[PDB]
Motif scaffolding. Structure first.
Motif, short mmCIF file in Angstrom:
data_model
loop_
_atom_site.label_atom_id
_atom_site.label_comp_id
_atom_site.label_asym_id
_atom_site.label_seq_id
_atom_site.Cartn_x
_atom_site.Cartn_y
_atom_site.Cartn_z
N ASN A 4 0.83 -1.20 0.00
CA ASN A 4 0.00 0.00 0.00
C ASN A 4 0.86 1.26 0.00
O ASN A 4 0.58 2.22 -0.73
CB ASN A 4 -0.94 -0.01 1.21
CG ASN A 4 -2.32 -0.54 0.86
OD1 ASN A 4 -3.11 0.13 0.21
ND2 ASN A 4 -2.61 -1.76 1.31
N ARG A 5 1.92 1.27 0.81
CA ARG A 5 2.83 2.41 0.83
C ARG A 5 3.51 2.58 -0.52
O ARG A 5 3.68 3.71 -1.01
CB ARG A 5 3.87 2.25 1.94
CG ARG A 5 3.46 2.88 3.26
CD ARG A 5 4.54 2.70 4.32
NE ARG A 5 4.80 1.29 4.63
CZ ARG A 5 3.95 0.49 5.26
NH1 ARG A 5 2.76 0.91 5.67
NH2 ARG A 5 4.30 -0.77 5.49
N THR A 36 2.30 1.71 -3.49
CA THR A 36 1.33 2.25 -4.43
C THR A 36 1.10 3.74 -4.20
O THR A 36 1.06 4.53 -5.16
CB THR A 36 0.00 1.49 -4.33
OG1 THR A 36 -0.54 1.63 -3.01
CG2 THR A 36 0.20 0.01 -4.65
N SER A 37 0.96 4.14 -2.93
CA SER A 37 0.78 5.55 -2.63
C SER A 37 1.96 6.37 -3.13
O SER A 37 1.78 7.41 -3.77
CB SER A 37 0.61 5.74 -1.12
OG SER A 37 0.54 7.12 -0.78
N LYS A 83 1.92 6.58 -7.10
CA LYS A 83 0.93 7.53 -7.63
C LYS A 83 1.33 8.97 -7.33
O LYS A 83 1.22 9.84 -8.20
CB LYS A 83 -0.46 7.23 -7.07
CG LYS A 83 -1.27 6.24 -7.91
CD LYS A 83 -2.39 5.59 -7.11
CE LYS A 83 -1.86 4.66 -6.04
NZ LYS A 83 -1.39 3.37 -6.63
N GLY A 84 1.80 9.23 -6.11
CA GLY A 84 2.25 10.57 -5.78
C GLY A 84 3.37 11.04 -6.68
O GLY A 84 3.37 12.18 -7.14
N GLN A 110 2.09 11.84 -10.26
CA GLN A 110 1.42 13.14 -10.30
C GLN A 110 2.43 14.27 -10.12
O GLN A 110 2.27 15.36 -10.68
CB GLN A 110 0.33 13.22 -9.24
CG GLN A 110 -0.64 14.41 -9.39
CD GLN A 110 -0.94 14.82 -10.84
OE1 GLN A 110 -0.92 14.01 -11.76
NE2 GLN A 110 -1.19 16.11 -11.03
N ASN A 167 3.10 17.45 -12.52
CA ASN A 167 3.20 18.82 -12.03
C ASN A 167 4.48 19.49 -12.52
O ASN A 167 4.49 20.67 -12.86
CB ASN A 167 3.13 18.83 -10.51
CG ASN A 167 1.75 18.47 -9.99
OD1 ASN A 167 0.74 18.91 -10.52
ND2 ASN A 167 1.71 17.66 -8.93
#
Lengths: 50, 50
Positions: free
Chosen positions: B2-3, B5-6, B9-10, B13, B17
């Protein structure tokens, strides 16, 4: 023999109680994973908003 | 997992940016180009009036 029969039936009764518990656990885990999906998405686009 | 994947994705993005920022940079430099053209033309033609 009567004592053994009663003890055996007790364990059989307890087995399905344990299975009910595991069912509760699986349902709660599914709900938690569904929540985790939204948390991950929010963590994603918070970077975009930043 | 989970960490991971987070974080992934961050970071994706974040890369988007950074691309937005680089686009802003080229736009500003483009405008500075037309400004520089006018200033250079003024500087060159000032001598004629001098």
């Amino acid at each position: 023999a009567n004592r053994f029969t009663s003890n055996i039936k007790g364990l059989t009764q307890a087995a399905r109680n344990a299975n009910d518990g595991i069912s509760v656990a699986q349902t709660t885990e599914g709900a938690l994973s569904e929540i985790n999906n939204n948390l991950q998405r929010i963590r994603e686009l918070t970077v975009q908003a930043s």
